[PDB]
Ligand binder design. Structure first.
Ligand code: K
Ligand code: K
Ligand code: K
Ligand code: K
Ligand code: K
Ligand code: K
Ligand code: K
Ligand code: K
Ligand code: K
Ligand code: K
Ligand code: K
Ligand code: K
Ligand code: K
Ligand code: K
Ligand code: K
Ligand code: K
Ligand code: K
Ligand code: K
Ligand code: K
Ligand code: K
Ligand code: K
Ligand code: MG
Ligand code: MG
Ligand code: MG
Ligand code: MG
Ligand code: MG
Ligand code: MG
Ligand code: MG
Ligand code: MG
Ligand code: MG
Ligand code: MG
Ligand code: MG
Ligand code: MG
Ligand code: MG
Ligand code: MG
Ligand code: MG
Ligand code: MG
Ligand code: MG
Ligand code: MG
Ligand code: MG
Ligand code: MG
Ligand code: MG
Ligand code: MG
Ligand code: MG
Ligand code: MG
Ligand code: MG
Ligand code: MG
Ligand code: MG
Lengths: 70, 55, 88, 117, 271, 103
RNA sequence: UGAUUCAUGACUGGGGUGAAGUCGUAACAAGGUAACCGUAGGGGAACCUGCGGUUGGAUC
RNA sequence: GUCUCGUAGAGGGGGGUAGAAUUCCAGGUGUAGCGGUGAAAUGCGUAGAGAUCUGGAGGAAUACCGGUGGCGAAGGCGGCCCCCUGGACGAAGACUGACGCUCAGGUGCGAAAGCGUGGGGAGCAAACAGGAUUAGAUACCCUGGUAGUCCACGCCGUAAACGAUGUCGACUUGGAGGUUGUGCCGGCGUGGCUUCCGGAGCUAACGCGUUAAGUCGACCGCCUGGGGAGUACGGCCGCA
């Protein structure tokens, strides 16, 4: 994240850009993930849970476009 | 085949900070994503590419 | 571990001709060549347990082929262990 | 007492505090202020407002130097990442460049154990 | 190799030998021998000036080449030998011109190996160069302290020195003690480590084995009378004072280095 | 007899030694019945990051076919030569003679 | 002079049952620090802590 | 089962090297706080900390790539480079001719912790110390911190060592994916491994469902109410 404020660019526009370049770098999420040690069994357990959730939710979405609520 | 020397192509697969871009975003095949990562890591060692953007 | 040339040489010396790669004598001679060649690798790498599993498979595969040859034609068996330098 | 006009603002934004240090371009500090020393302790010290007050006090501590232009280096995940920059522009400095310099190990050392609260 | 003795007698139960089958079994090279009779720790006033020295086996002195200044001429190792005078083994080397010399045996050196000294010698174990010509970071032994004086540092079995930096006329060394020490870059050093690293694994096993080495018994000061030692005295086992040498100086932490002349060369003390 | 790709980077102040170093190296491959498939001189380039506080270096790329022994010797030369600030030896499946993307 | 087997022995180890007195509240809900396994150290007690492992964890 | 050609791979053993970060050391600038929590205090700081810049030392781990992705008998394996080395798969043929499957006893491998000898020690952290919380708090929280975690060699032989599902072979409707080969003209096939759903059937139910917990055969291991107890005694093994 190296935001060079260009000429005539107002400060607020540069401030929203730097914020965008930070979030697109994931620096905040990366720092929060490195604050404490995660056991390898814990890392594996939560990687699997996020994949089961991404899958089982998409499979229910397909069953919710083929059904009427009223 | 991917070349660690072919710097112009490699730059398409790294972010502005220098990180390798996920294959799910560039739509690269898995077999070639693995060759890209190897090539990018060789180029970094030869200082043809940066490790992090604060260089 | 055996190169193409070394393999082909063994096939010619123990087979019926140049492409008798399947005879028991050739197989046993090929295994013997790899077992002996790998003795130098495991003298230096005593903790390479994963490779040694492959070596022990060669040893047991050779033992079974020898036990089969001895049960079929004892004469061919006796000649073979003598040429190769095997106890049994 | 020598003029500079071209400085660098370093923002140390941790979860508990915000430290603002203005240096020249070679890293030599000219003045500093912290959210903790600006009249806030405890839960008040770790707020974006307390960070803003620190940014103002730092701008005052270096007003003798005649600084006009600033690059901004932000470090850390704390709540004072943005309110300090907003206050540095409102202080009259021309914000030329904004950069994140938060350290990231490329693996590195094992972090402390997770808290059981 | 490190070999435990079997406990066929109480004096053998704890013995551990260092057995090296590569050492010469015959006699040493006679032109490089000198007699070297014993002192009992006594000086030329006839007084004991270092306690606990006396007896032990007769020993001939081997003339060892610590200077390593026969430059440009290769030598081949003829054999390794036991040297009673030191912990390291030594190697008899034959130069191309027909001269023979003894050197400290580096780790890995064996009969048939080739060695050389001088500015243009290859960077190989057993070769000796001025440290000006040795890469920073290398491991070396038998290091000179003044150019041309001869090796004086890292000579004991298994020891070595690390060249950590080179600035101008000086190199910085990490010694075995942990001290960081500056030495002139023109001082020579031999590549590698001193051999016989297993030396420290031996176990003497019995009192007589120390007597064979010329070491006489140590009597504890607390076992004496007050007239003999500050620790002496007491009805029963008593102590009640700060531990001192037989001459009264504190002996559990008090520092005794006092050499302002060489202080300029110590970058960092061992601790 | 395997195929190797060698890149080494020279201290810019010793750029005048590169043509000498190049000839010396290939003479060691050729003298051992090894071939040179490709030899490029990339000149001074900007380093992506400083190395030994430098900011530029003189790159050289070769492709040879040599026995492992002379390549092991070549790497010993690189390690102890103060001008070579960084090198890299890689095996290649086949000989490579086509022009690299640098030229 | 051994082996084996039965009986017995100051004292001591844990176990079961009964009964409920004293001390806490470890587990069952996310049981209020998810639980459990192997191991190690510690602690009046249930247990606590480290290291790796499991889901036979709620929430998301 | 052998040979030929090729393919993917964190499979193993050995050596080298790179960049980020932490800590420590030195110096420059600079001045009153820093750090920590629910709030605090212990702790660190005017003997100049924290912050910021430059240089050095050292150990350990390899961000991104990264994936219900890959490899391995299991345990497990993740930067890059070289050296030694095991297995798997595919396409066309050639070769041997039942050489096969399973396996009591036996032998080998076997996470983490732990043990022995010698090294190493940045970060983390049992024990321990202090500060808090509390009725108490031998805890959870905070500030520190030693074994240990790392390396070499040897020992130990256990884990919810799990798919709580032994190995081998045959057979029995489907759908959508991942990964890695290969044939043919993006399109059509054909192999290997793998994820999710679900049919018949099976099941106490939950569920399993061509990778079976369906339908069969071969061989082995194991169970026989709860507690006492995987304990006692004896044997074997182990330094413990
Ligand atoms: K000796
Ligand atoms: K004594
Ligand atoms: K006494
Ligand atoms: K006494
Ligand atoms: K007495
Ligand atoms: K009895
Ligand atoms: K609990
Ligand atoms: K629970
Ligand atoms: K435990
Ligand atoms: K008590
Ligand atoms: K391989
Ligand atoms: K068995
Ligand atoms: K700690
Ligand atoms: K309470
Ligand atoms: K420690
Ligand atoms: K054990
Ligand atoms: K499992
Ligand atoms: K497929
Ligand atoms: K296909
Ligand atoms: K079985
Ligand atoms: K022990
Ligand atoms: Mg084979
Ligand atoms: Mg903390
Ligand atoms: Mg003495
Ligand atoms: Mg002596
Ligand atoms: Mg003594
Ligand atoms: Mg007396
Ligand atoms: Mg007296
Ligand atoms: Mg008394
Ligand atoms: Mg007393
Ligand atoms: Mg409870
Ligand atoms: Mg609980
Ligand atoms: Mg148990
Ligand atoms: Mg405790
Ligand atoms: Mg705790
Ligand atoms: Mg362990
Ligand atoms: Mg212990
Ligand atoms: Mg140990
Ligand atoms: Mg140790
Ligand atoms: Mg703690
Ligand atoms: Mg078990
Ligand atoms: Mg497991
Ligand atoms: Mg599992
Ligand atoms: Mg089981
Ligand atoms: Mg199903
Ligand atoms: Mg059933
Ligand atoms: Mg038992
Ligand atoms: Mg045992």
């Amino acid at each position: 994240p190296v935001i060079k404020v260009r000429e005539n660019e107002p400060f607020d526009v540069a401030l929203r850009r730097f914020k965008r370049s930070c979030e697109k770098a994931g620096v905040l999420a990366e720092v929060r993930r490195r604050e404490f040690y995660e056991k390898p069994t814990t890392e594996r357990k939560r990687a699997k849970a996020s994949a089961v959730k991404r899958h089982a939710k998409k499979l229910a979405r397909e069953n919710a476009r083929r059904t009427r609520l009223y | 085949e991917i070349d660690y020397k072919d710097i112009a192509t490699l730059k398409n697969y790294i972010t502005e900070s220098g990180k390798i871009v996920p294959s799910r975003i560039t739509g690269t095949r898995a077999k070639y994503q693995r060759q890209l990562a190897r090539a990018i890591k060789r180029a970094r060692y030869l200082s043809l590419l940066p490790y992090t953007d604060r260089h | 571990s055996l190169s193409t040339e070394a393999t082909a040489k063994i096939v010619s010396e123990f087979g019926r001709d140049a492409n008798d790669t399947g005879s028991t004598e050739v197989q046993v001679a090929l295994l013997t060549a790899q077992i002996n060649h790998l003795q130098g690798h495991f003298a230096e790498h005593k903790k390479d347990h994963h490779s040694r599993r492959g070596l022990l498979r060669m040893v047991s595969q050779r033992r079974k082929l020898l036990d089969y040859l001895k049960r079929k034609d004892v004469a061919r068996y006796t000649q073979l262990i003598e040429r190769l330098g095997l106890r049994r | 007492r020598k003029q500079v006009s071209d400085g660098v603002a370093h923002i140390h934004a941790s979860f508990n505090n915000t430290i603002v240090t203005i240096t020249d371009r070679q890293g030599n500090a000219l003045g500093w202020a912290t959210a903790g020393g600006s009249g806030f302790r405890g839960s008040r010290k770790s707020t974006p407002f307390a960070a803003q007050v620190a940014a103002e006090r730092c701008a005052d501590a270096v007003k003798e130097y005649g600084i006009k232009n600033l690059e901004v280096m932000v470090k850390g995940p704390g709540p004072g990442r943005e309110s300090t920059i907003r206050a540095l522009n409102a202080a009259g400095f021309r914000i030329t460049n904004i950069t994140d310099v938060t350290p990231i190990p490329h693996x590195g050392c094992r972090p402390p154990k997770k808290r059981r609260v | 190799a490190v070999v435990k003795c079997k406990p066929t007698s109480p004096g053998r139960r704890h013995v551990v030998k260092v057995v090296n089958p590569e050492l010469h079994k015959g006699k040493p090279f006679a032109p490089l021998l000198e007699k070297n009779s014993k002192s009992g720790g006594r000086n030329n006033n006839g007084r004991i000036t270092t306690r606990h020295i006396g007896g032990g086996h007769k020993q001939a002195y081997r003339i060892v080449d610590f200077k390593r200044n026969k430059d440009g001429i290769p030598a081949v190792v003829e054999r390794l030998e036991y040297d009673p005078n030191r912990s390291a083994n030594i190697a008899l080397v034959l130069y191309k011109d027909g001269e023979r010399r003894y050197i400290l045996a580096p780790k890995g050196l064996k009969a048939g190996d080739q060695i050389q000294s001088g500015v243009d010698a290859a960077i190989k174990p057993g070769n000796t160069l001025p440290m000006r010509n040795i890469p920073v970071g290398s491991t070396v032994h038998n290091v000179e302290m003044k150019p041309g004086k001869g090796g004086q540092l890292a000579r004991s079995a298994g020891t070595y020195v690390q060249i950590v930096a080179r600035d101008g006329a000086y190199v910085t060394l990490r010694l075995r003690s942990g001290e960081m020490r500056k030495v002139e870059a023109d001082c020579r050093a031999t590549l590698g480590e001193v051999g016989n690293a297993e030396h420290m694994l031996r176990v003497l096993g019995k009192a007589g084995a120390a007597r064979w080495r010329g070491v006489r018994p140590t009597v504890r000061g607390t076992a004496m009378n007050p007239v003999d030692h500050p620790h002496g005295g007491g009805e029963g086992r008593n102590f009640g004072k700060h531990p001192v040498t037989p001459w009264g100086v504190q002996t559990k932490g008090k520092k005794t280095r006092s050499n302002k002349r060489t202080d300029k060369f110590i970058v960092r003390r061992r601790s | 007899m395997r195929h190797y790709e060698i890149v080494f980077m020279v201290h810019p102040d010793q750029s005048e030694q590169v043509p000498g170093m190049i000839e010396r190296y290939t003479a060691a491959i050729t003298g051992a019945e090894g071939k040179i498939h490709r030899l490029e001189d990339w000149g001074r380039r900007q380093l992506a990051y400083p190395i030994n506080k430098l900011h530029k270096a003189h790159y050289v790329l070769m492709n040879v076919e040599a026995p492992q022994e002379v390549i092991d010797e070549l790497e010993t030369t690189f390690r102890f030569n103060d001008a070579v600030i960084r090198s890299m030896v890689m095996r290649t499946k086949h000989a490579v003679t086509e022009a690299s993307p640098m030229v």
